[PDB]
Structures are given as C-alpha cells and as structure tokens.
Amino acid sequence: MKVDLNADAGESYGAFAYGHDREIFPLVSSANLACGFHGGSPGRILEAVRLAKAHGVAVGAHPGFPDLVGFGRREMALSPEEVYADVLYQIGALSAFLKAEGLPLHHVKPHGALYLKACRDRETARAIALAVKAFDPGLPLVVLPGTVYEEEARKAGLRVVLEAFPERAYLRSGQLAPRSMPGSWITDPEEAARRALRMVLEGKVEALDGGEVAVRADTLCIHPNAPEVARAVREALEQAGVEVRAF
Amino acid sequence: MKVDLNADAGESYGAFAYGHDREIFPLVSSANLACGFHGGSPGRILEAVRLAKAHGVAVGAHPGFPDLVGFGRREMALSPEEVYADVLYQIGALSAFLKAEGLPLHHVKPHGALYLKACRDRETARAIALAVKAFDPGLPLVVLPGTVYEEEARKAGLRVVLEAFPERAYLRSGQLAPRSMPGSWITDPEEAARRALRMVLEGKVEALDGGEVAVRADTLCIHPNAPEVARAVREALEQAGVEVRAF
Amino acid sequence: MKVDLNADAGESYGAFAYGHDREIFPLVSSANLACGFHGGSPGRILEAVRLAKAHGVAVGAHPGFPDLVGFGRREMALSPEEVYADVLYQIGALSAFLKAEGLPLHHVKPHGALYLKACRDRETARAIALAVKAFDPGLPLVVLPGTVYEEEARKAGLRVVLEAFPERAYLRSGQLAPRSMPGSWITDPEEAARRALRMVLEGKVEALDGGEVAVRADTLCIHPNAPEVARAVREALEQAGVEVRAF
Amino acid sequence: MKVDLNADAGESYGAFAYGHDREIFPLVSSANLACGFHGGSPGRILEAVRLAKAHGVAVGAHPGFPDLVGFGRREMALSPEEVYADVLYQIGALSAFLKAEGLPLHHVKPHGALYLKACRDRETARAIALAVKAFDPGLPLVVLPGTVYEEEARKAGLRVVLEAFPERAYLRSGQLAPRSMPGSWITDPEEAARRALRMVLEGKVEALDGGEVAVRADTLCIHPNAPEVARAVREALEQAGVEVRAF
C-alpha cells in the first residue's frame, strides 16, 4: 500500500530563515510551499523549489491570508472575491518558479487561518476551489475530510485529496481535537509513527474521547522537532512495507 | 501600416485607485499590468484583466522593484539573482489571472526604476531576460532601442519589441532627453500625435538638440491628461490610415 | 455653545493620493491622521501634519489594523497583546512628526475595523485604552457612546470624548443604524447640517425606526462629496452662533 | 576607564525570530533596536524593550530603509526628504514602547545600507541628523569617525558618539577594510577581545595594510557566534578593569 507524506516548506522570508526544509525534504513525498503572503519571499521560493527538485519532492501551493507579520495564522474578514483573487495570485506566482525548474504544480493546500476559515465557511471554501479550478481544473485540492471545505471542493468539480494528521488527536466525531485540549497534540514521534501506520494500514485512529474513528489518509501532514517526527513516521511506514509516494 | 499603442494600467492598490484605466483601455492596443510589487493588488489585477478583456486589449506584465510606497520609482540595489526571482514571481502571479480569464500573456515590460536600471546595467537586464525566457521562451520583451537592455535580451535569445515615446523628447544620440531638461516632455497631445505619426510613417523624430534621429516604433508608449494624449494619438493614426493593433 | 468637527486625513500612501485633505482641513477643527498601517506613509504623514498646522487644525492619531491593501476595513483576529503593541507603535510614529512641527498629540481615535472591533470586544477596547494610557495618561480617547468601548476607556481611567455622526442614521436604541439599511446614511449635506445643529443645540437626533434619541456630541465626525457635507455642516453651525473648536 | 558595548537587537519580525537577543543583552551596555522597517514588528519591539529593561541595557533606535525582505541591507535611492520622514517615523514608533516601559531613548544609530549611504552621502547624512534633532536635540547620534556622516551630524549641532569595530579590520587610512577583503572580518573572539582592549586602553588598532591607526572608541559594535565574541570582549575588558557602561 502507498501514502503521501506532506509538510509545509519555503516559509522563510528574505533574511528571516524559517523551518527545517533541508531536514524535512528528504523525508516527505510532497511539500506545500508558501507563496509570499504569510511567508516565502521570491528568493526563498526559488530556493525551496530547487531543494524539492533536488530531492524529488512534489511541490504544491500553500496559499494564505495577506498577513506576513501574523504568519497567516490570524482570521481575516476577506470577502469571497478577495479570497479568490489572493489564491489565484499566489498559485500563479509559485507556478512560475516550477515552470522555470521544469516541474509541475502538484496540488494546492490552504495555509493556517485561511485553511481553518475554509473548513467552516462555505463561501471561503468555494472561492478557494474556484480559484484553483480557474487556474487548472486538473489540480487536486488537499482538504480535511468531513468539512464544508471538502463539500465545496467536490461541488466545484475538483479532484479532492484527503489529509490526516498523525500528530493531532481526533475526537469520536471524526474531527480534530481542539488545540489547547489536554493531549490534543501528539509530541512523541514514536506514537505519531504508530498512529500513522494505523491510519494507513487500518484506516482508523484512536479517539481522545473514547474508542476510535475512521480516517482515510491519502496524505499525512507533518508539522520544532518536526524532523524527528517525520523521520520516525517515514521509517515506521517503510519498515512496514508501505510506499511513501506523491498522490 | 500598423503599430501598437501601449500604456501602463492596473496600478491601483486596494482602496487606493490609481490612473485612468477606464479611459485609457478603449484607446490602446496593449497594456502593461502591475504585478503587486509597485502597485496592483490582487483584486485590482483581476479588475484590470477583466477590463482589458472587455476592450480586447492585449495584456503584458509590468514587473517592478519591491517598493510599494515608492511606486517602484526608486533605484534599489537588487542582486541579479533577486531581480530574476522577483520578475518570475510577478509574471507568474499575473499569468494566473490571464489563465482564469482565458487570455494569453502578451508581453513583458519592466516598470519604473527597474526599467531604467535594466537600460544601463547588463546584469539586471540579463536577469530580467532570463526570467522571462525561463517562464516562456516565446514571450516578447519590450525594450528601449540602442541600450544594453536590448542587447542582453537579444543575447538571451528572446524576441524583442522596440518601444518609442511620442511624449518624450529625443537627442541626436538617439536616446531620450533627460527628464528635467527644458522641453524634455511633450505635453501638447497635438504635437505628441504629430510626433507619433512621424515615428510610424517615417521612422524618424525631431531631436531636441538639432535635426532629427531614426526610431523604429514597434510600439508607442503613452503616459494626468494621459487620456487626452492617448486619444489625440490614436485618432491621428487612424485618420492617417494606420492600424493600431497589438504586436 | 461649542463643538468639535473631526475628519479622517493623511490616509494617502506613497504615490497613492487619498481623500481631500486640502478641502477638508479648512473646515474641521480636529483631524484623525493615519499612522502607516492602513494608510499614511511617512512622507504623507509629514505632509498632513504640515497642512493641519498651516490651518490650525488639532491632530490626533487614527490607528488601525495592519492591513494596507484592505485599508484597515477588515476584521482581523489580533490578540489584545498585538492590539496594544500596534496602537503604541502607531501613536508613537505620529507623535514624532508632531514633535518636529512643535504640535501636541490632541487625541486618539481607532480606524475602521479596529474601531468596530473595539465597540463590541472588551479585550480589544481595553488594549487600545491601555496603549493610549501608557503613552500619555492625559490623552483623550474618542469613543462611540453607549459601547463597551466607552466603558473600558473609562475603566482604564482615560478622559473620554463622545462622538456623534450627523451623516449616519440612528435607531431608537441609541446606536447607529446598520450600514446597508435603507436610509442608513444621510447623503444630503443640508439634512446632515440640519441633524448636526440638532445634536449640538438640542442633544437629540431623529431615529430611523421612529421618534428621536438622545446624543451628546463632544465631536461630530465627517466622512466623495465629504467637502460639501463638511462645508454645509460648519456653515450651519457658525451661522447658528455655535463655535467650532477642538475639544 | 569606561566604554560602551553595543549590539543590534529586536530585529525579529512576527513569527520570524532573528538574532540572539537573550544571549547578547546580558553582555552589552546599549542596544540598537529595529523600528519596523527592516525588521522589528511591534510585538517584537515590545519584547526587546522589556528584555533590555530587565537587563538594564540602554536602548537606542536602529532606523533603516523601508526594505523588509532585504533586511534594509540594500541601497535605496531615497530622497533626503524621504530619509528624514522615515527616520522620524521609526524613532517615534520605538519611543512609544520606551515611554510605556518608563525608559528614555538613549541614542540613534542607522542600520545597514542606510548607515552606509550616510557614510558617503552628505544629503542622506544631513537628513538623518535633522530628523534626530527635530525629535530631541539632546539625542546622541552614533557615527563612524572620519566620515561625512560625522561631519553633517556635527554641523547639525548634535552630540556625536564615535563607534569602533573590534570585529572588523582597519586600513592605514583609518577607515574599515572592504568586506570581502582577505582578513577583513575578525572571527576569533580572542583576537577581537584583544583588539577591543587595545582600542580602549591605547586608542589604536592594528592596520591590515601595515602598522596601526588611531581610533577613539566611545562605543564598540558587536555583530552567528556573536554571543561568544561579545562574551570574550566583555570579559577581556572587565578582567582588565575597564567599566562597560552606556555612554
């Protein structure tokens, strides 16, 4: 069986280095690159694309809100029209670097607060979906299963890719546990790898509030010690005979 | 005979409306749209592209320095690597809006200080040329004839388009007269139209410092009262039997 | 009797001219100057301060959200800590220009979405109040009467200035009528002037949903045709024997 | 004898942590804090000011060019008017945080390319000097000795503070050796400390191109392994009986 391992990257801005792209790229099969709004200045995008290419990592767009200082982690009251234009702008900018390096745009996955706004706001979700569709109808959109975001993406006629989080706790409802909830985030790479295997091999994950829940992981998202977690997860999957490859 | 009339557009940023796109688009055959660095926020780009499409105007990229407050009119010590990445980023962003609207990217023409830096700096000129070539080898680059900029563009293997300025005075050397030089800028739309016709029909323009100089105008650049000048110029050309069409 | 007439100003950014400061300054007694976040680049701030000084207009800070493209008109999920720091930064920046021109900082009044967030969010309101207090305990804060914003400002120990809007319709509740509600905004300068006089002379204004409501106007806020409205309002007040002066 | 040890700080921007303020502050007597243009977002400024206060470090403004992505390290063709306004804006913004924390603004020292432009351009140097003077005539300006920058500062009537660089090689001319010149930068903290002592105790430093040159160090500037160098330098000075205190 196979699964895609994805991680955010190229979020550095100018002189401000961010993340551990060098350590993460050799472990993942796909990367979500920032497009200059919440991170990723032009030179850093070019650098990240070159790194991904060198490591045979598939590159997708990681569009976000126009809030650099806030790293796109803050909710912003953008109109659907503004979301559509901002997403198009970002996808296009990244695609130029991929074109220069002879690589295709693999997917699109919203970043931070935009992602969250999409998961609970139909108009925002629809705007993202239409922007992606208008750019390339064939582009897959990474979404959180069971959300209005997955719904609008499907209604738009886009191919959807289901994401799972081995580092985040799940609730019986099938949705992610609230951030600051005791035990909401799995820190031990060993358990995360354990959970990852389970999600792939069995399509299920333990639930924080009792029992377990079903989850179909087309791709597994990886976050500090991210390299360690990513390492642990990839190894557990490969030692298990699971192929880690871009979706 | 035919000639292209081009003007900058889509330079508005957010709530800050700029220029007279509505009045200029029905007069020109090509437009140079800002890409978010010295002007042109995403929503304004989308708006300008829609307007151009409605008026059958060809759209090209107008990349500039990353200096919004300065409107990209200030020289910046960008390394060639930075110029290359910034230009790619901008061309890509604009191309996404054209793709959504089913339009092709017609050309590329640097804006303000970047344009000027290119005209006198070989490394900058080369960086712009390579960025354009890396994105689409078939993209024509608008340049100032007789400059190192035209040279590097040709050395890069790109198709070059020669620009002339009916509103600017020329010197016997064949280059544009210094900005603050007495009589450097033609304000009377009548004379500008007069000069425009001459450049097209005869391939020559009066020189400020005596006599006249040769000029091949594949395209004529148009700037306040820009609409009046553009109007006067287009009419003089059409009443003369000259076809105004995108190059 | 006397009253202060205030209007926003200095919102231009770089090459992007905004508003009609030249036409408005000779009509108002106080101005709320942008501080570089939603508008007002350094050069434009300096320009606005010089203009105010030339016209003997009192200058206050008009801090907003860090959203230039959105003109600070979009709600942003800033933490109270972030609101506090952003407001301090802005007040300080403007105060430097006033110091250079030998003028005092007259007041503080939040801009756009920040203002609205303050009117309904106690933590945001408190953060603004504390920032102002930390900079100068003696600085008056302009607020909307009957809001949690007025409450937190008073709880913080700051002097509060009550603002009224002759151009906006009021509801019996005493609060402003919703923006897109039929008849929510008074366009006729004559009626606005009429309402303005009433608010000053009688401390009351007609209510959109029947009868009238009480309103104490320490200052009257003025907005396109803003100059006309401002003109009409100031004249109605002066021809009525009401002194227009900074609070 | 006494001397001031200064280092840049507070350059982090939003989520982008930069430098080693925590390690450097306990070693220096003065810090040059970024003001939001080339680094230092509002929250990070507040954080740096709090840290300095906790460590009894004197805080000065470190104004720079409006080039965040370039970290203010790139030459920009700002007019003297623009330099003046930008510097005022920045000094004012930082002063608000100092006021809130009950601390005075200790000095002003330009950052990166602005600093370099000032050292060779009289109009830029004058603009900086006048901005500082307009804000507070009593504010000392840190300058490079023997430059047009020191000259304009003195002509402006400002108190000037002479800076020396124990980590940079000097030429017989008395000016700093070119960056990429073999041996231009002292990496060994031991030698840097050695040089530092010499500059203080003897007012001289070895010259790269032979012999030595005179240098009066009112303050010593400290830069990766900056903490190590700063540590080595402070210890060498204290073990030598030299008092490290703000000028």
Q: Which two tokens stand for residue A185?
A: 């985030």
Decide if C69 touches A, using CB distance below 8 A.
yes
Per residue, what are the HEC states of chain D?
CEEEEEEEECCCECCECCCCHHHHCCCCCEEEEECCCCCCCHHHHHHHHHHHHHCCCEEEEECCCCCCCCCCCCCECCCHHHHHHHHHHHHHHHHHHHHHCCCCCCCECCCHHHHHHHHHCHHHHHHHHHHHHHHCCCCCEEECCCCHHHHHHHHCCCCEEEEECCCECECCCCCECCCCCCCCECCCHHHHHHHHHHHHHHCEEEECCCCEEECCCCEEEECCCHHHHHHHHHHHHHCCCCEECCC
Residue B71 DSSP symbol: T
Residue of D nearest to A17 (CA): D16
The answer for residues whose C-beta is within 8 angstroms of residue A57's C-beta and 6 or more apart is A25, A28, A29, A30, A31, A51, A246
CB B91 within 8 Å of CB B105: yes
How many domains does the structure of chain A reveal?
1
Interchain CB distance below 8 Å, B75 and D76 = yes
Output DSSP code: residue B177. P
Which residues 149-208 in chain B show a CB within 8 A of chain C? none
Cβ contact C28:C102 at 8 Å: no
Query: Measured over all CA atoms, what is the biggest interatomic distance in chain C, rounded to whole angstroms?
Result: 50
Using DSSP, state whether B241 is helix, strand or coil: coil
Phi-psi sector, D245: left (phi>0), alpha (psi -120 to 50), beta:
beta
What count of CB pairs under 8 Å joins C to D? 79
Question: Which SS3 state, helix, strand or coil, does residue C189 take?
Answer: helix
| Strands C212-214 and C204-206, bridge-based pairing | antiparallel
| Secondary element (H or E) of residue B16 | none
Burial degree of D62 (CB within 10 A; 0-12, 13-18, 19+):
buried
Residue A145 makes CB contacts below 8 A (sequence gap 6+) with A162, A163, A164, A174, A215, A216
List the subunits that have 3+ CB pairs under 8 angstroms with C. A, B, D
Pairing of strands B204-206, B212-214: antiparallel
Residue of chain D whose alpha carbon sits nearest to that of C101: D134
Alpha carbon of B247: minimum distance to chain C alpha carbons (Å):
31
**Segment holding B223, helix H or strand E:** none
Buried b (16+ CB within 10 A) or exposed e, C54-73: ebebbbbbbbbbbbbbbbbb
| C-beta neighbour count of B134 within 10 angstroms | 19
Interchain contact, A113 vs C77, CB within 8 Å = yes
A134 touches chain B (CB under 8 A): yes
What is d(CA B48, CA B33) in angstroms, rounded to the nearest whole number? 8
Asked if residues B9 and B31 have their Cβ atoms less than 8 Å apart, the reply is yes
Give the DSSP letter string of B104-119. Answer: ----B---HHHHHHHH
Using CB atoms, list chains with 3+ pairs below 8 Å to chain A.
B, C, D
User: How many CA within 13 A on the CB side of residue A62?
Assistant: 27
CB B10 within 8 A of CB B34: yes
Experimental method: X-ray
Let me know if C36 is exposed, middle or buried by CB neighbors in 10 A (0-12, 13-18, 19+): buried
Judging by DSSP bridges, how do beta strands C204-206 and C160-164 pair with one another? unpaired
CB A83 within 8 A of CB A108: no
How far apart (Å, rounded) are the C-alpha atoms in residues C21 and C31?
A: 9
CATH of the domain at B104: 3.20.20.370
| Separation CA C125–CA C144 (nearest Å) | 11
Q: Nearest CB to D96: which of C82, C92, C97?
A: C92
CB D185 within 8 A of CB D224: no
Q: Which of B130, B133, B157, B129 is nearest to B143 (CA)?
A: B129
Q: What is the largest CA-CA distance in chain D?
A: 50
Residue C4: C-alpha distances to residues C91, C129, C218 (Å) = 21, 21, 6
Nearest Cβ partner for C43 among D85, D90, D93? D85
* C131 three-class SS: helix
Separation CA C96–CA D96 (nearest Å): 10
Contact A60, A105 (CB under 8 A): yes
C142, C48, C162: which is closest to C100 by C-alpha? C48
Cβ-defined contact of A74 to C78 (cutoff 8 Å): yes
Range of the domain at C68: 1-247
C99 token code pair: 């110091």
